[PDB]
């Protein structure tokens, strides 16, 4: 259950991540949201899991 909860949370955040075309267009809101998501979930934790 704990694993499933954390997997669902990571999935929801990833789906909340902005689209690549918005990122290329350089929308401030999109860049800020991506920065927040990266702050929440470290990359090393994802690689470890």
């Amino acid at each position: 259950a704990i694993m499933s909860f954390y997997a669902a949370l990571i999935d929801l955040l990833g789906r909340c991540a902005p689209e690549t075309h918005l990122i290329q267009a350089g929308k401030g809101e999109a860049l800020r949201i991506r920065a927040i998501l990266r702050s929440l979930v470290p990359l090393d934790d994802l690689v470890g899991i």
Binding site: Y6, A8, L9, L13, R15, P18, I33, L40
Partner: protein, 49 residues
């Protein structure tokens, strides 16, 4: 309560992701709400401990 947490996360996932693309309007709102209530991230992603 990881089980209920996962159910609510599933609903939020369906709210934010549509037809393989992220809905920015819903995703930004959901991310802001989640960070405004950090307990939604579970005890692991809790800041203090």
């Amino acid at each position: 309560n990881p089980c209920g947490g996962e159910r609510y996360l599933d609903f939020l996932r369906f709210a934010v992701f549509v037809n393989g693309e992220s809905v920015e309007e819903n995703a930004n709102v959901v991310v802001r709400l989640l960070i405004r209530k950090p307990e939604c991230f579970g005890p692991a992603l809790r800041g203090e401990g």
